[PDB]
Design a protein around this ligand. Structure first.
Ligand code: FES
Ligand SMILES: [Mg+2]
Length: 202
């Protein structure tokens, strides 16, 4: 379908109660999915469950870098009844390693997701993405922010939908130069999607 934003599909990720039940039962604030294509891993994250902070809006660092309307988004609002659910690509934009967002860590210098800071550290070359600052790079070699998956919460049903991205994912074999290039099939994208709940302490 093209019922998402600017030519993207509208894809149901999960119901809010699936996310909340997982957080209550396991403590795991990360929820993996694939979008817009089956081989493109992403994750939802409840930034308040993760950090203890009421994070309800983060910047779009790619404003004006791509055509509108996706390029015209200034900020990304958190979704659901608490306003705190966001989503990102799970593919590092340095060299395409899959990011271990499920490995919850207590130091900034450990690969994984540093919960207190909402910082996602790639094991391959040490890129660190500041999720609560819109995925911007705060350390390491990644040349641009981690792409955000734009979400829409259906208040009638509780369902959380993925509806676009603010940027192209990592370019592996096929160049991706616009968000909508995420709709291109690249056989080099062979990444799996972790089972939920996936979190571990690392
Ligand atoms: S592939 Fe992630 S830091 Fe290089
Ligand atoms: Mg930090």
């Amino acid at each position: 379908n093209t019922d998402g934003l600017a030519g993207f599909p509208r894809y149901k990720v999960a119901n809010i109660q699936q996310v909340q039940q997982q957080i209550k039962s396991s403590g795991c604030a990360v929820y993996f999915f694939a979008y817009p294509l089956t081989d493109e891993p992403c994750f939802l994250v409840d930034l308040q469950a993760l950090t203890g902070q009421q994070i309800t809006e983060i910047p779009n660092p790619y404003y004006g870098k791509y055509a509108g309307p996706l390029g015209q988004i200034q900020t990304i609002k958190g979704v659901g009844p608490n306003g705190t659910i966001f989503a990102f690509s799970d593919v590092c934009v340095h060299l395409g390693c899959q990011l271990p967002a499920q490995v919850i860590v207590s130091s900034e210098s450990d690969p994984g997701l540093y919960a207190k800071g909402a910082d996602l550290h790639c094991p391959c070359h040490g890129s660190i993405y500041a999720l609560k600052d819109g995925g911007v790079v705060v350390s390491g070699p990644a040349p641009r922010p981690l792409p955000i998956v734009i979400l829409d919460y259906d208040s009638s049903t509780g369902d959380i939908y993925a509806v676009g991205t603010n940027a192209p994912y990592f370019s592996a074999g096929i160049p991706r130069t616009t968000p909508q290039d995420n709709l291109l099939y690249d056989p080099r994208y062979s990444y799996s999607v972790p089972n939920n709940p996936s979190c571990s302490n690392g």
